[PDB]
């Protein structure tokens, strides 16, 4: 019976909130970070954007967090790859339009694999070009070198839920369907068949 | 400051536009003790009567 048509309350997203007495203080620090440029996007220059992607291992949900800068990981020993990291970054960027600004609690997807080595590797060897973006890197690396099914399997393995679980949860909340459409995914449903996956370009 | 006072009334103020938040204004509040008028005086009966 555990299921909800709300994107923020899906099994793969974690709710976080500072201690209930330190909430006013953490608001001032978020404004301090807004004064500096402390926000990563998929449209700004990758040279600038990769300087502000610092995933942190989570041990408790009582942690301060900012909507446009925080990405979370759980303590593990597995190592992610470039494609998994790009898929997770795109997922977390397109999943933040539905973030709840009015409330004191924030929801964030967790990364099953360690992305720190890949982020450091990428940061060591990126030049200051005027046109390269994170979305461009995603399109060149994931869309043009993988099938939709393989990329969906990678994304499912990068969050706790299995492939069948994503396909099932996509039918209940339309927000997840929109999020996956933004990542250039297409789902086709036919009777008596399992779902097939395709990129938006080839459909 | 206005929305945080606690009294018998619920004060509601529409949220300020992001641009109109720095706008400056003057609000003078007096800082003086009023407890020195309420002493015992040889003309207190006059105060009561009037």
């Amino acid at each position: 019976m555990n299921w909800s048509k709300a994107i923020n309350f899906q099994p793969f997203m974690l709710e976080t909130r500072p201690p209930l007495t330190t909430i006013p203080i953490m608001d001032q620090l978020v404004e301090i970070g807004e004064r500096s440029n402390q926000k990563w996007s998929m449209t700004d220059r990758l040279f600038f954007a990769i300087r502000k992607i610092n995933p942190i291992f989570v041990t408790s949900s009582q942690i301060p967090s900012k909507f446009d800068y925080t990405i979370l990981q759980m303590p593990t020993q597995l190592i992610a790859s470039l494609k998994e990291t790009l898929l997770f970054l795109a997922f977390s960027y397109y999943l933040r339009e539905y973030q709840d600004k009015v409330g004191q609690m924030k929801f964030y997807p967790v990364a099953m694999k360690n992305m720190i080595p890949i982020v450091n590797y990428l940061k060591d060897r990126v030049h200051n070009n005027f046109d390269t973006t994170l979305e461009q890197a995603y399109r060149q690396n994931v869309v043009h070198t993988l099938s939709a099914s393989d990329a969906f399997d990678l994304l499912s393995g990068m969050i706790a839920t299995t492939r069948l679980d994503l396909i099932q949860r996509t039918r209940i909340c339309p927000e997840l369907l929109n999020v996956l459409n933004k990542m250039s995914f297409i789902l086709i449903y036919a009777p008596n068949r399992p779902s097939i996956l395709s990129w938006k370009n080839q459909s | 400051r206005i929305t945080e006072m606690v009294n018998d009334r619920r004060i509601m103020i529409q949220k300020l536009t992001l641009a109109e938040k720095p706008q400056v204004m003057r609000h003078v509040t007096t800082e003086i003790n009023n407890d020195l008028f309420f002493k015992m005086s040889p003309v207190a009966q006059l105060y009561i009567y009037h």
Binding site: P19, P24, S36 | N33, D35
Partner: protein
């Protein structure tokens, strides 16, 4: 006293010190215009002595500024890790230097070598050790762990690095100068200043209990010297000497302001003139 200090401590401490200074100024101003009357001074302060406004805090009661102090103290000295480190390093907003330390160094903290050749007894601003065996001249006998700055006086059978009577290094090391037999004595007196502020120690004693009653598992009543030594030893390894000064100023100013709100006496200069 167990506690962890994050890397956002200077930013929290600047706001805390500004709040403490504003409250002290408010108290002094309300104190100089108190006319003796039916209303007591405690009632007089509660009515128009807690109403202080600035960025963030918006309370008009002494309980409000007390809770603001509680929030800042918990966020700075007891909360585990506020944010990823790079978020703090890239802060551009700047802070104001705190006043210089004025606490006299009486019980200076030193550690003996692993050998156990010497025995350490303390006095007022003076460390004297005796030799259980014979030891060669020119080796370390004592080193100072608590930072100290000032002049050096009355050194016997030992040598310290000083020019013109003033110490050169913040952590002086005492070395033997002449060969000596067993059961001798070497002394080293100091006219110096340690970390902390000497004034307002009465308020600290009653404010540390107030903020220990709330954080009972983390903070316990103790002396000012021990409190400051533990706070300095619990600072993060990578921090500039400018930020640690602000952190320590707030760490000592919170208890004195808490105790000053209780006993309605004057505030020390290092809190008032921030």
């Amino acid at each position: 006293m167990n506690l962890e200090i994050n890397n956002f401590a200077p930013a929290i401490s600047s706001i805390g010190s500004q709040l403490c200074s504003l409250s002290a100024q408010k108290l002094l101003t309300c104190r100089k215009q108190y006319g003796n009357g039916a209303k007591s001074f405690e009632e007089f302060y509660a009515e128009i002595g807690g109403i202080i406004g600035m960025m963030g805090i918006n309370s008009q009661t002494p309980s409000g500024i007390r809770e603001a102090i509680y929030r800042l103290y918990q966020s700075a000295f007891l909360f585990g890790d506020i944010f990823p480190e790079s978020f703090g390093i890239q802060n551009t907003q700047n802070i104001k230097p705190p006043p210089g330390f004025t606490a006299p160094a009486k019980k200076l903290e030193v550690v003996l070598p692993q050998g156990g050749a010497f025995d350490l007894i303390y006095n007022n601003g003076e460390i004297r050790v005796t030799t259980t065996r014979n030891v060669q001249a020119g080796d370390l006998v004592c080193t100072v762990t608590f930072p100290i700055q000032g002049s050096v006086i009355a050194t016997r059978n030992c040598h310290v690095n000083e020019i013109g009577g003033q110490l050169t290094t913040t952590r002086p090391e005492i070395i033997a100068s002449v060969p000596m037999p067993a059961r001798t004595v070497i002394v080293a007196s100091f006219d110096a200043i340690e970390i902390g502020y000497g004034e307002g120690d009465d308020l600290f004693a009653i404010g540390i209990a107030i903020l220990s009653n709330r954080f009972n598992g983390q903070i316990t009543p103790m002396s000012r010297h021990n409190y400051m030594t533990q706070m300095f030893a619990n600072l993060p390894a990578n921090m500039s000497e400018r930020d640690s000064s602000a952190v320590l100023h707030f760490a000592q100013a919170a208890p004195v302001v808490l105790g000053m709100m209780e006993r309605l006496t004057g505030a020390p200069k290092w809190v008032l003139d921030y």
